[PDB]
């Protein structure tokens, strides 16, 4: 629409559609560090000046939910505290459009160092399929920005993020007179997180925290979407 971040939003969605959906399984610069069920979590080891930046990428397949649903739930701030366990406080700093907000939040200490806070634009978008033979893609991008009404917090260190949750609904209609049900749909999810913790910590500790907290978030967040949509009509 007409807001000042539409160009940046476009570039991010684009970067993510081209570079983030890419296959990471046989990629030797990624290591698969967590596997649970349909979930796989990868990281690539990266540091710049002693600071761990490790790109992370998780794939998941979740039964009975659509991509539209998973992204709605991921994006929607009124349900955040139902699933998010790492947040201390947050608030919407601005509304840019009906699908784009800027959020400030403070995180619980996940290592014994200063709390980190973050200031990011969170946008939800549908990428149209090219044919009706492919899935439409829903994506939430969360990436850092600056705002007059949210400068640096004396106590907290400022993390910078570039995150995306990308989902696609696979449908598999039954052969007979039955109506399509939640049994017939599967959500493919790619979640990517590139975080700059904003200062130093021992790499072993930050890496053990990523390994612990990302899979805990995915399991709990996806399970939550499954619970909140069970029995309801399907939103594609």
Ligand X SMILES: CCCCCCCCCCCCCCCC(=O)N[C@@H](CO)C[C@@H](O)c1ccccc1
Which residues make up each annotated binding site for an N-acylsphing-4-enine?
A: 84, 105, 142, 191
- Out of 21, 161, 182, 219, the only residue in the binding site for ligand X (CB under 6 A) is 161
Choices 19-27, 40-48, 157-165, 224-232; region in contact with ligand X by CB under 6 A: 157-165
Strand partners, 146: none
Spatial distance between the Cα atoms of 135 and 117, rounded to a whole number of angstroms: 35
Give the C-alpha distances (Å, rounded to integers) separating 117 from 16, 99, 153, 176. Answer: 24, 23, 8, 53
CB-wise, 38 or 84, nearer to ligand X?
Answer: 84
Choosing from 96, 100, 195, 201, the residue that interacts with ligand X (CB under 6 A) is 195
Q: Does 152 bind ligand X (CB under 6 A)?
A: no
| CA-based R_g, the chain, Å | 18
- Interaction pattern, residues 77-96, with ligand X; x per rule: CB under 6 A: ---x---x-xx---------
Give the C-alpha separation, 234 to 236, whole Å: 6
75 binds ligand X (CB under 6 A): no
CA distances from 46 to 43, 119, 227 (A): 9, 23, 36
Q: Does the footprint of ligand X cover residue 118 (CB under 6 A)?
A: yes
């Amino acid at each position: 629409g007409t807001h000042r971040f539409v160009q940046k939003v476009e570039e991010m969605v684009q970067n993510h559609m081209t570079y983030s959906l890419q296959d990471v399984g046989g990629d030797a610069n990624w290591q698969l560090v967590v596997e649970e069920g349909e979930m796989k979590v990868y990281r690539r080891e990266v540091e710049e000046n002693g600071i761990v930046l490790d790109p992370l990428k998780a794939t998941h397949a979740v039964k009975g939910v659509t991509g539209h649903e998973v992204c709605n739930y991921f994006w929607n701030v009124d349900v955040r505290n139902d699933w998010e366990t790492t947040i201390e406080n947050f608030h919407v700093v601005e509304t840019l459009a009906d699908n784009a907000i800027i959020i400030y939040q403070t995180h619980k200490r996940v290592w014994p160092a200063s709390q980190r806070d973050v200031l990011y634009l969170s946008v939800i978008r549908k990428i149209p399929a090219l044919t009706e033979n492919d899935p439409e893609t829903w994506i939430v991008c969360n990436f850092s920005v600056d705002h007059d009404s949210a400068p640096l917090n004396n106590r907290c260190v400022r993390a910078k993020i570039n995150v995306a949750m990308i989902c696609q609904t696979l449908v598999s209609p039954p052969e007979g007179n039955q109506e399509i049900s939640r049994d017939n749909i599967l959500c493919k999810i790619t979640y990517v997180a590139n975080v700059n913790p904003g200062g130093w910590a021992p790499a072993s500790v930050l890496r053990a925290v990523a390994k612990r907290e990302y899979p805990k978030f995915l399991k709990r967040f996806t399970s939550y979407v499954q619970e909140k949509t069970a029995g309801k009509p399907i939103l594609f």
